[PDB]
């Protein structure tokens, strides 16, 4: 998980570059650490591929699908000595295991805390993943427009775009100018209103129950207080 | 639920890979929801009866190591509850017969119905705990010897040993709290020896306080003989 | 006998590709083909160069340094009128629609460089190719008698292969989406019927 | 609530004012956006209400970062801080207030047991079309809130029937129904009750309360038993 | 020159300097144990309390 | 034995700085260093002045009065081509990237004043410094062989100290955030163990 975070940081570094460039051994120590991380990733879904009680069920769990659009393009990248900023943002989808690994370090010991970190993790992972997607769309162009209507957005400009979008603020200073980009923004507004009206709002309201008679008494000095118990009613 | 969870999940219980799954028709109240949210990987609740086969399958009763049936101590009719628990025993033993079931019985007379059920086997480890009989007997036996109930309660219950330094009664009290009861086959060097000699060798040389014994030879099954005389020798088994 | 969850998710994945094999075919039918077949409407003519002149009106191009520079130089304009064979009229040449839609008044937008003299020489070097070869060797030239009555293209916006990949790869996604569903049912039917051969 | 809202809003406006007056420091403070403080206040009010005109917006990277953090913080303390405290200031009861004394409209207060059955027959005869022109408005005072059938029946008569929640054993409720100005009060007794005498004594209690409030009044009441009728004669008024 | 930095430096050194003094005074008081402060909470301590009227007027004025 | 609320909020404040010591380090790694190390990629050359000329194309600067005035005057352009030592090519000088990105066609944007003659004299005064000292005293000059193949800078956008404060002050915030947590635990452990020395 920590090396997955490191690969995501490598993606964040590589998002400040053009579409591709030719390397041999070093340009920013770019692929040199990426190859090591991805070889460890290959070994990690290697030894749990043999741990599959169902060889098909492991193949379609989205926990190696994230580990699966990344590693063969890294092998092609080191076979060709050039980089590509493709579906590497899918590594951010592995942030869904953050509550699971944070439970291992004895930091969270509360079911409300586990559920809260699960919600924040699926929110941040979905948001960064979709931001990487529409970043990848907007760096390129509409291909029927021969890749000419490219919108040179930073990844983090695009992150700002999705936070302004999902909260229905919509400044319009930054927006998708490509047809495929507008199409994905339509789909993601519908998906965001889907999993806000169906995923969270019955789990948000599990973290909203409060009881209005609890706590203790503030011992104010000088105020002798009486505790009154027994049957208590408007009459008595 | 609280008393059972406390003894079962007591820290002194050390490493036990047993997860308690609770099946009850009534949904848990807020105090139950807090108590179930005090144990995550350890306690799961499910809604449903044990009188429906699908619910037994949902709780995986067949793979379950044992099923414990708890009877409300306070009820309008003791016999009615006892018959409900016997009904639950019949349902579980009809689903999967090779299972241990530990149950609570409010009345001593209602215990016979379990014996009437064919699958139930006492020797197989199926056991029925009669609350009325045990509580009254503990009170009774204590009428003979004042304070026996506390001694017997501190044996089986896992209770946390606390270091006390000051000369109080609690310091001498906790010297015997951490004792428990244990069942064990005797060694082969005790064959044909008298019970007082074996108790002397257990308490003198290796500080064990032996109470009772098994005894079976072609008669009815192996009774529990509390402190036999020198009249009865110790068998190999 | 029941569909297991490995089998069931393969069915859910297999239907997801059958649907998206239709939708990607359905999107590209008017998002890719609608600009394509309008470009394929203009036919190959065989036209001759009428006249090549200049105007004197500058037009502001935009060069760059590479690290996001917005340098804007200027280039002179050249109007290459040609004599069509089919619609036999006086019409301009255009390198593509991208040269046409940005500046229809010019025939050749040079790649914009920093110095104006660099952009000047790229004009006359292109102009020298059309001041020596006039009338002789009539070339293939694309013209539409529907949209642009007086504009002739030199190329297309696309290739012959632009009809291929819009029909191919959603149908490739469609067939593979079927082969997931078919091989799930067939292997299950071999795993539910051949088990009872006892 | 209004104080924490205004204080948070002005504080965050001052923060992003301070950010936007300066620039991004890696841009060597060159992308400064010369915002007034109150332009920035307008920006945050347009932002938090999710209106988002886009005429004014943060053009600095650190500014965009704080606007992301403050949109998340604003949706945090709107979904977690106020909306269970907003809904403490939202509870209203739909049967209270008093009766508008319209001049010329002699109103009747109807009390006693009130239900769809008892109320329907009286309303039908009183509001019958053949009754022609009668300026009498029936006002019903009952402790129990009306059921959905009662709500439909009361919403079949608008300028004619008003319900109010309250007893006739409290003087304030009698004042709310304007009993003193009321032409007459009709007390309806549930025909079906566990004890006839108990209900009869309750209706006599209601008579005593109304005649103690305002003695010069006509009261028409229902009595379940003939023997209980004498108590009304015993009342002096 | 642009001496904007000294203000924030002064406030933060007042914060974590004054925070460490409270921690180390609560360190050395419980480290020396290993090997007229009475009425001063009453001159102004009562005055700070909202119950005092002068105290309420002081809160309103500040 | 319990953490008191003064102790507990110090732990909550101490963790808040340990987290923000990471995040401020994490933000500035690609929000401060990513523009920084690209500027540190261009190396020190030792280049000679090739030629200093003018063009005649005006460029519209923007002066001000002080109380939000948008006065726009104009200034002539000067192209100072220099001969590099390392990449040995004909390339312009630029005062910084800010002079480069706004007007790459000029070498020196003067500070814009109201009168055009004021902006005119600031050009030729700068030009006189480069029309007398030509070829002699080859100066240090920054050039990148990756991004700008024909643009040479005179300065950097930043200093050597730009690597310091992006790594220093989040780590200063990180250590102080640790020292709050450590001294809370240690003083509590001296306040819970040394109390029982009775
Ligand atoms: C290019 C186009 C890309 C656009 C696609 C972006 C979204 C795809 C990913 C969306 C999120 C998918 C992942 C959603 C997901 O996994 O949900 C689940 C998490 O709960 P969890 O597993 O912990 O339950 C534990 C169990 O014990 C419940 O009791
Ligand atoms: C079911 C899903 C199906 C998806 C799979 C099908 C869809 C995906 C492939 C489409 C077919 C191949 C694309 C066409 C490739 C062939 C054409 C090609 O090579 O395009 C290049 C540009 O690429 C560009 O935009 C620049 C971007 C290069 C690719 C970067 C990644 C894009 C990933 C996008 C995702 C160069 O041309 P160029 O500029 O000179 O012309 C402008 C000039 O004429 C100016 O007038
Ligand atoms: C599927 C819809 C995609 C078809 C949209 C399309 O091709 O039209 C383009 C512009 O429209 C568009 O950008 C519309 C993009 C938004 C598509 C939203 C569809 C949601 C369903 C043409 O571009 P033009 O140069 O002709 O103008
Ligand atoms: C630069 C970055 C700056 C950005 C930071 C802006 C927000 C920070 C301040 C947010 C608000 C913090 C203050 C929030 C706060 O104090 O809440 C409390 C108020 O309730 P109160 O005390 O009365 O309860 C009385 C008790 O008796 C409850 O029973
Ligand atoms: C954990 C948190 C860590 C936060 C603490 C660390 C971050 C905060 C300090 C950064 C390091 C010091 C900043 C750099 C100071 C050294 C550099 C400096 O003095 O900058 C001045 C400008 O200031 C400016 O923007 C103008 C604003 C001055 C400061 C006003 C308050 C800003 C507070 C912002 C908050 C002058 O340069 P100048 O213009 O000539 O260059 C453009 C010229 O080259 C045109 O080409
Ligand atoms: C942490 C993210 C901050 C990194 C954002 C960043 O440095 O990119 C700048 C522009 O992007 C940005 O303004 C993005 C600002 C929005 C950041 C939103 C991040 C929310 C998480 C570069 O500026 P440019 O000149 O290269 O374009
Ligand atoms: C948020 C916290 C940690 C920041 C406060 C730390 C202060 C003490 C540090 C952070 C960066 C430092 C500044 C770095 C840049 C200039 C260099 C020079 O022109 C004079 C001093 C000056 C202005 C320094 C003064 C002290 C300084 C402001
Ligand atoms: C309340 C207490 C903590 C105040 C201490 C704050 C310190 C950090 C502040 C307040 C006074 C400040 C000084 C003000 C003026 C002097 C001389 C000037 O030419 C340069 C800066 C310099 C040298 C400053 C250094 C930082 C400074 C010493
Ligand atoms: C040249 O001219 C004719 C008539 O315009 C045209 O049809 C054809 O494209 C060219 N001829 C040949 C043989 O290609
Ligand atoms: C050439 O000249 C004119 C001008 O376009 C045109 O009308 C005529 O048809 C052309 N003749 C030939 C032979 O192409
Ligand atoms: C001047 O010239 C050389 C070669 O370009 C260069 O390496 C160096 O920076 C300068 N020489 C010295 C001694 O600084
Ligand atoms: C100077 O002249 C040319 C023009 O840039 C260049 O190719 C050559 O290398 C330079 N010579 C020296 C000695 O710098």
3-state secondary structure chain C: CCCCHHHHHHHHHHHHHHHHHHHHHHHHCCCCHHHHHHHCCCEEEEEEEEEEEECCCCEECCCCCCCCCCCCCEECCEEEEEECCCCCCEEEEECCHHHHHHCCCCCCCCCCCCCHHHHHHHHHHHHHHHHCCCCCCCEEEEECCCCCCCEEECCCCCCHHHHHHHHHHHHHHHHHHHHHHHHHHHHHHHHHCHHHCC
DSSP conformational letter for F195: G
Contacts (Cβ under 8 Å, ≥6 apart) of E3: none
Phi first, then psi, for residue B97 (nearest 5°) are: -75, -35
Contacts of F54 in chain C (CB under 8 A): none
The torsion angle over the Cα atoms of residues D75, D76, D78 and D80, rounded to 10 degrees, is 150
Q: What is the CA radius of gyration of chain B?
A: 21
Residue F102 CA to residue D31 CA, distance in Å, equals 13
Give the torsion through C-alpha atoms of D82, D85, D87, D88, to 10 deg.
Answer: -170
In angstroms, rounded to a whole number, what is the distance separating the alpha carbons of residues A112 and C20? 38
- Residue A66, judged by CB atoms within 10 A of its CB (0-12, 13-18, 19+), counts as buried
Q: Determine the distance separating the centroid of ligand 12 and the alpha carbon of F97, expressed in angstroms.
A: 24
Asked if residue F80 lies in contact with residue F49, where contact means CB atoms within 8 angstroms, the answer is yes
Dist. CA F78–CA A178, nearest whole Å: 40
Ligand 6 close to Cβ of residue A12 (< 6 A): no
Contact status of C40 with chain A (Cβ, < 8 Å): no
Spatial contact of F89 and F150, defined as CB atoms under 8 Å apart: yes
DSSP character for A86?
S
In whole angstroms, what is the distance from residue B144 CA to residue B167 CA? Answer: 30
Q: Using CB atoms within 10 A of its CB, is residue B44 exposed (0-12), middle (13-18) or buried (19+)?
A: middle
Q: Which atom of ligand 3 is nearest to the CA of C27?
A: 1
Closest ligand 7 atom to the C-alpha of F172?
Answer: 3
Cβ-nearest to C10 among A56, A144, A146: A56
User: Contact A67/A44 with Cβ under 8 angstroms?
Assistant: yes
Tokens of F187: 């003083």
Q: Which of F43, F83, F84, F85 to mutate to test the pocket of ligand 11 (most atoms within 8 A of CB)?
A: F85
- Among chain D, residues having any CB pair with chain A shorter than 8 Å are 47, 50-54, 57, 59, 61, 64, 67-68, 71-72, 75, 79-80, 84
Q: What was the experiment behind these coordinates? A: cryo-EM
Residue-wise DSSP of B127-185: EEEEHHHHHHHHHHHHHHSTTHHHHHHHHHS--------SSSHHHHHTTTTT------P
- Give the ligand at the shortest distance from the Cα of C81: 10
Half-sphere exposure for B38 (CA within 13 Å, toward CB): 10
In sequence order, which ranges of chain A are alpha helices (DSSP H)?
A: 2-14, 30-47, 55-60, 71-80, 98-104, 111-139, 155-166, 179-197
C50: which 2 tokens? 């009428």
Q: What share of chain F is helix, strand, coil (3-state, %, to 5)?
A: 45, 20, 35
Other Cβ atoms less than 10 A from the Cβ of C13: the count is 15
Q: Cα-atom radius of gyration of chain E, to the nearest Å?
A: 19
Query: Rounded distance, CA B71 to CA B89, Å?
Result: 12
- What is the length of chain B? 237
Q: Is A69 helix (H, G, I), strand (E, B) or coil?
A: coil
Question: Which residues' Cβ are closer than 6 Å to ligand 4?
Answer: D 4, 8, 11-12, 15
Q: Do F35 and D28 touch (CB under 8 A)?
A: no
> How far is D44 from D70, CA to CA, in rounded Å?
9
Kind of pairing between the strands at B100-105 and B66-69: parallel
Tokens of F146: 């990756």
CA of D70, closest atom in ligand 4: 4
The total of other beta-carbon atoms located within 10 Å of residue E10's CB is 10
**The pair of three-digit structure tokens given for residue C100, joined into one six-digit string:** 């046409």
Largest CA distance in chain E: 52
Resolution (A): 3.5
Pocket of ligand 10 (CB under 6 A): C 48, 83, 85, 88-90
The minimal CB distance from C66 to the residues F97, F105, F148 is found for: F148
Q: Which atom of ligand 12 is nearest to the CA of F85?
A: 14
Which residues, at least 6 apart from B65, have a Cβ–Cβ distance to it below 8 Å?
A: B18, B100
D160 is in an annotated binding site: yes
Residues from chain A that touch D61, judged by Cβ atoms under 8 A, are 156
CA of C84 to the centre of ligand 9 (A): 11
The helix/strand/coil state of A142 is: coil
Structure tokens at E50: 């909202």
Breaks in chain C at C–N > 2.5 Å: after which residues?
none
Q: Which residues contact A162 (CB under 8 A, 6 or more apart)?
A: A127, A130, A131, A134, A188
Residues of C in contact with A146 (CB under 8 A): 98, 157
The per-type count for chain F, helices as H runs and strands as E runs, is 5, 7
* Ligand lying closest to the C-alpha of residue F89: 12
Sort out which chain F residues have CB atoms less than 8 A from D32's CB and list them.
none
Closest CA to D153 of D187, D120, D105: D120
- Would you say the CB of residue F72 lies under 6 angstroms from ligand 12? no
Q: Do D26 and F35 touch (CB under 8 A)?
A: yes
Q: Are F35 and D26 in contact (CB under 8 A)?
A: yes
Say how far apart CA D169 and CA D190 lie, in whole Å: 18
CB proximity F12 to D under 8 Å: no
| Separation CA B90–CA B95 (nearest Å) | 9
The answer, for F30 touching chain A at a CB cutoff of 8 Å, is yes
Token look-up 């079976």 returns B216
CA of C83 to the centre of ligand 9 (A): 14
Tokens representing B34 are 């807090």
CB contacts, 8 Å: A60 with chain C: 6, 9-10, 13
Structure tokens at F92: 């312009």
| Residues of chain D neighbouring F98 (CB-CB closer than 8 A) | 28, 30
Q: Are C59 and C106 in contact (CB under 8 A)?
A: yes
A111 CB within 8 Å of a chain B CB: yes
Cα three-residue angle F36-F40-F44, rounded to 5 degrees: 155
Distances (CA, A) of A139 to A15, A69, A150, A229, D209: 10, 19, 6, 71, 84
Please check if D27 is assigned to a binding site.
no
Contact of D207 with D112, CB cutoff 8 Å: no
- Cβ of F37 closer than 6 Å to ligand 6, yes or no, is no
B207: left (phi > 0), else alpha (psi -120 to 50), else beta? left
Spatial separation of the C-alpha atoms in residues A141 and C186, rounded to whole Å: 42
Question: What distance in Å separates the CA atoms of residue C92 and residue C107, rounded to the nearest whole number?
Answer: 7
Tokens 């009680």 correspond to: A53
* B133 is known to lie in a ligand binding site: no
Which token pair is C94?
């255009």
The closest CB to that of F190, out of E16, E20, E27, belongs to: E27
- Exposed, middle or buried by CB within 10 Å (0-12, 13-18, 19+), for D3? exposed
Q: Are D110 and D185 in contact (CB under 8 A)?
A: yes
> E8 CB under 6 A from ligand 8?
no
Identify whether the C-beta of residue B192 lies closer than 8 Å to the C-beta of residue B179. no
Report how far ligand 12's centroid is from the alpha carbon of F50 (Å): 9
Q: How far apart are CA A182 and CA A218, in angstroms?
A: 57
Task: Report the candidate in C150, C153, C170 with the shortest Cα–Cα distance to residue C45.
Answer: C153
Helix (H, G, I), strand (E, B) or coil at F107: coil
**Which residues face D22 on adjacent strands?**
none
Task: Give the closest residue (by CA) to ligand 3 atom 17.
Answer: A183
Return d(Cα C28, Cα C171) in angstroms, integer: 12
- Chain B touches chain F, with at least 3 Cβ pairs below 8 Å, answer no
Neighbouring subunits of B (3+ Cβ pairs under 8 A):
A
Question: Comparing C-alpha atoms, which of A67, A57, A49, A64 is closest to residue C184?
Answer: A57
CB atoms within 10 A of CB B21: 14
State how far Cα D212 lies from the chain centre. Answer: 30
Which H or E run contains D138?
strand D136-142
Length of chain F: 198
Rounded Cα distance between D146 and D148, Å, is 7
Which residues 53-72 of chain C have a CB within 8 Å of chain A?
Answer: 68
Distance from C-alpha of B24 to C-alpha of B71, rounded to nearest angstrom = 12
Cβ-nearest to F31 among D26, D28, D30: D26
- How far apart CA D137 and CA C27 sit, in angstroms, is 68
How is B92-129 classified by DSSP, letter by letter? HHHH-SS-EEEEEES-STTHHHHHHSSS--TTTT-EEE
Is A68 strand, coil or helix? coil
Give the range of the structural domain holding residue C19, as residue numbers without chain letter.
1-198
Q: State in Å: Cα C88 to ligand 10 middle.
A: 5
Dihedral, CA atoms, A47, A51, A57, A63, nearest 10 degrees?
Answer: -40
Strand partners, D188: D112
As a whole number of angstroms, the distance between CA A47 and CA A51 comes to 7
Residue B37 is inside which H or E element, if any? none
- Reading the block at residue F175, the tokens are 């250590």
CB < 8 Å & 24+ apart, contacts of A135-138: A135/A15, A135/A89, A136/A85, A136/A86, A136/A87, A136/A89, A137/A176, A137/A178, A137/A180, A137/A181, A137/A184, A138/A176, A138/A177, A138/A178, A138/A181
Side-chain-side CA neighbours of C143 within 13 Å: the count stands at 24
Report the half-sphere exposure of A78 (CA within 13 A, side-chain side): 15
Rounded to whole angstroms, the Cα distance separating D109 from D79 reads: 46
Contact status, residue B179 vs residue B150, Cβ threshold 8 Å = no
The residue with tokens 């291909």 is A143
Quote the CA–CA distance of A73 and A88 in Å, as a whole number: 9
Terminal alpha carbon distance of chain E: 34
Number of structural domains (chain F) is 1
Backbone angles phi, psi at F44, to 5 degrees: -75, 120
Residues of C in contact with F149 (CB under 8 A): 66
Any ligand 8 atom below 6 A from CB of E28: no
Q: CA angle, A76 as apex, A72 and A81 as ends, to 5°?
A: 145
Give the DSSP H/E element, type plus range, for residue E18: helix E5-28
The tokens of D75 are what?
């949706």
Which residue has 């933060």 as its token pair? E12
Q: How far is the CA of F46 from the centre of ligand 11 (A)?
A: 5
């Amino acid at each position: 998980f920590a090396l997955s975070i490191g690969a995501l940081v490598i993606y964040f570094i590589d998002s400040s570059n053009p579409i591709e460039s030719c390397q041999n051994f070093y340009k920013d120590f770019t692929l040199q650490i990426d190859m090591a991380f991805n070889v460890f990733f290959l070994l990690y879904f290697g030894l749990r591929f043999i741990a599959a009680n169902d060889k098909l069920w492991f193949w379609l769990e989205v926990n190696s699908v994230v580990d699966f659009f990344t590693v063969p393009p890294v092998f092609v990248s080191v076979y060709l000595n050039r980089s590509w900023l493709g579906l590497r943002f899918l590594r951010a989808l592995r942030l869904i295991q953050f509550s699971e690994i944070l439970q291992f370090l004895n930091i969270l010991k509360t079911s409300n805390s586990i559920k809260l970190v699960n919600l924040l993790s699926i929110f941040i992972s979905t948001w960064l993943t979709a931001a990487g997607f529409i970043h990848l769309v907007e760096n390129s162009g509409d291909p029927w427009e021969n890749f000419q209507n490219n919108q040179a957005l930073t990844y983090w400009e695009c992150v700002y775009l999705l936070m302004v979008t999902m909260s229905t603020v919509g400044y319009g200073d930054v927006y998708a100018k490509t047809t495929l980009g507008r199409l994905f923004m339509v789909f993601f507004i519908l998906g965001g209103l889907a999993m806000f009206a169906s995923y969270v709002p019955e789990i948000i309201e599990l973290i909203g129950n409060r009881k209005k008679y609890g706590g203790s008494y503030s011992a104010v000095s000088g105020r002798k207080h009486i505790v009154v118990c027994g049957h208590i009613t408007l009459e008595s | 639920v609280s008393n059972f969870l406390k003894d079962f999940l007591h820290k002194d219980r050390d490493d036990v890979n047993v997860e308690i799954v609770f099946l009850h028709n009534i949904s848990p109240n807020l105090e139950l929801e807090a108590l179930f949210k005090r144990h995550f990987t350890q306690v799961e609740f499910y809604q449903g009866s044990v009188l429906n086969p699908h619910d037994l399958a949902r709780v995986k009763i067949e793979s379950a190591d044992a099923c414990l049936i708890l009877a409300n101590k306070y009820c309008a009719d003791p016999d009615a509850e006892d018959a409900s628990n016997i009904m639950r025993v019949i349902s579980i033993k009809n689903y999967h017969p090779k299972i241990r079931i530990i149950t609570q019985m409010l009345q001593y007379h209602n215990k016979a119905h379990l014996l009437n059920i064919p699958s139930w086997n006492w020797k197989e480890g199926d056991d029925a705990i009669c609350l009325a009989e045990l509580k009254l007997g503990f009170i009774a036996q204590s009428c003979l010897a004042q304070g026996l109930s506390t001694m017997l309660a501190n044996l089986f219950s896992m209770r946390s040993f606390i270091k006390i330094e000051e000369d109080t009664w609690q310091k001498y009290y906790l010297e015997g709290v951490s004792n428990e009861m244990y069942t064990e086959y005797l060694s082969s060097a005790f064959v044909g020896l008298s019970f007082p000699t074996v108790c002397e060798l257990c308490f003198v040389k290796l500080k064990l306080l032996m109470i009772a014994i098994e005894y079976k030879s072609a008669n009815r099954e192996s009774r529990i003989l509390i402190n036999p005389g020198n009249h009865l020798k110790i068998q190999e088994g | 006998y029941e569909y297991t969850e490995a089998e069931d998710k393969s069915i859910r994945l297999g239907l997801f590709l059958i649907i998206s094999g239709v939708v990607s075919l359905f999107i590209f039918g008017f998002c890719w083909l609608s600009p394509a077949l309008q470009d394929l409407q203009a036919t190959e003519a065989n036209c001759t160069v009428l006249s090549v002149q200049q105007i004197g009106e500058v037009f502001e191009c935009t060069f760059t340094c590479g690290a996001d520079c917005r340098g804007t130089s200027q280039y002179p304009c050249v109007q290459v009128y040609v004599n069509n064979s089919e619609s036999n009229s006086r019409a301009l040449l255009h390198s593509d629609e991208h040269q046409l839609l940005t500046n229809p008044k010019c025939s050749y937008i040079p790649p914009c460089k920093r110095e104006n003299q660099k952009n000047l020489e790229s004009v006359m070097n292109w102009q020298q190719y059309w001041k020596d070869e006039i009338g002789s060797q009539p070339f293939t030239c694309y013209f539409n008698q529907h949209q642009r009555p007086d504009d002739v293209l030199l190329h297309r916006t696309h290739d012959e292969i632009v009809l291929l990949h819009c029909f191919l790869w959603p149908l490739v996604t469609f067939v593979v989406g079927v082969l997931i569903v078919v091989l799930t049912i067939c292997a299950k039917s071999l795993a539910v019927k051949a088990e009872a051969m006892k | 609530l209004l104080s924490i809202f205004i204080s948070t809003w002005l504080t965050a406006a001052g923060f992003i004012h301070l950010v936007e007056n300066s620039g991004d420091p890696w841009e060597n403070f060159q992308n400064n956006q010369a915002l007034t403080y109150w332009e920035c206040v307008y920006l945050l009010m347009v932002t938090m209400s999710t209106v988002g005109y886009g005429d004014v917006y943060a053009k600095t990277t650190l500014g965009r970062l704080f606007m992301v953090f403050f949109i998340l913080g604003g949706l945090a303390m709107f979904a977690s801080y106020v909306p269970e405290i907003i809904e403490l200031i939202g509870n209203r009861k739909k049967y209270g207030g008093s009766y508008s004394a319209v001049s010329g409209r002699k109103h009747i207060v109807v009390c006693g047991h009130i239900t769809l059955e008892s109320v329907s027959n009286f309303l039908k005869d009183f509001l019958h079309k053949d009754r022609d022109d009668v300026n009498v408005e029936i006002v019903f005072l009952h402790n129990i809130s009306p059921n959905l059938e009662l709500e439909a029946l009361f919403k079949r008569h608008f300028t004619q029937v008003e319900f109010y929640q309250g007893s006739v054993l409290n003087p304030h409720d009698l004042a709310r129904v304007k009993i003193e100005s009321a032409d007459a009060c009709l007390i309806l007794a549930n025909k079906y009750c566990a004890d006839p005498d108990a209900e009869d004594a309750s209706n006599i209690m209601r008579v005593i309360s109304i005649k103690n409030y305002h003695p010069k009044i006509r009261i028409i009441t229902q009595m379940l038993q003939y023997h209980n009728k004498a108590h009304l004669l015993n009342i002096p008024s | 020159q642009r001496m904007w930095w000294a203000f924030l430096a002064s406030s933060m050194v007042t914060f974590f300097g004054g925070l460490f003094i409270i921690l180390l005074w609560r360190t050395l008081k419980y480290l020396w144990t290993v090997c007229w402060m009475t009425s001063v909470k009453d001159w102004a301590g009562v005055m700070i309390s909202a119950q005092t009227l002068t105290g309420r007027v002081l809160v309103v004025l500040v």
